[PDB]
């Protein structure tokens, strides 16, 4: 690790600076270095890790979709052959995306998840594991596509089971997990009815628990509840 010589606290400080500078590749590298110090992550640190890699892989996914769209048009009946270049460059971006996903999954497996005992940390990491298998699934086409999908499903399901036992229905981690597992059902598992059921039930159970919350907790929960509603509106 090229971050092995830097203090853990310095890596966290520089991750925050990189975020302010919109240098998310640097942010992710700093937070990978922090994880590799071997200590558990605090709540703030877990969110720095997720923000960094979400921004990195989000850009890769956007680029991959642009290139895949160009590639599909290039292979429509009537198009002018233009050689291997579109496929080659889509493959290049795809391989870099898979690399980032494998890096995140590696951090979760070595050893964030196994040391995570509290619901807020364990659900958070298992949600990440589902998310990064989901991004691998978006680009998968080979002998392993079904196994990648099932790895995402399995991680999301373990996270769901813990969240329903250990967190209130308005907990923002529980809500964001349900949001993303619902999108997994719709976009990856070809299960739109499951996606809609999950989003609606999550929204309704959260609504009924809002009365227990402070103003600041209410704002956090209703923000994610609006995303659930947004998707339901998209899908119905």
């Amino acid at each position: 690790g090229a971050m092995g010589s830097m203090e853990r606290a310095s890596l966290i400080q520089k991750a925050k600076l990189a975020e302010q500078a919109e240098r998310y590749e640097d942010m992710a590298a700093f937070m990978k270095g922090a994880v590799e110090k071997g200590e558990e992550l605090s709540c703030e640190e877990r969110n720095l890790l997720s923000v960094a890699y979400k921004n990195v892989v989000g850009g890769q996914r956007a680029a991959w979709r642009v290139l895949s769209s160009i590639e599909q048009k290039s292979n429509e009946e009537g198009s002018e052959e233009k050689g291997p270049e579109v496929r080659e460059y889509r493959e290049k971006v795809e391989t870099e995306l898979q690399g980032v996903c494998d890096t995140v999954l590696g951090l979760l497996d070595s050893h964030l998840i196994k040391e995570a005992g509290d619901a807020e940390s364990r659900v958070f990491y298992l949600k990440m594991k589902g998310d990064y298998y989901r991004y691998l699934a978006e680009v998968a086409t080979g002998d392993d596509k079904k196994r990648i999908i099932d790895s995402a499903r399995s991680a999301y399901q373990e996270a769901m089971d813990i969240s329903k036992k250990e967190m209130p229905p308005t907990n923002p981690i529980r809500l964001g997990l349900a949001l993303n597992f619902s999108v997994f059902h719709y976009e990856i598992a070809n299960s739109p009815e499951e996606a809609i059921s999950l989003a609606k039930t999550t929204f309704d159970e959260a609504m009924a628990d809002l009365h227990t919350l402070s103003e600041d907790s209410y704002k956090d929960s209703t923000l994610i509840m609006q995303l659930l509603r947004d998707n339901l509106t998209l899908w119905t």
């Binding site: 998310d131 964001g176 949001l179 995303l227 998707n231």
Partner: peptide, 5 residues
């Protein structure tokens, strides 16, 4: 695309 967080 749909919303994820």
């Amino acid at each position: 695309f749909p919303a994820t967080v």
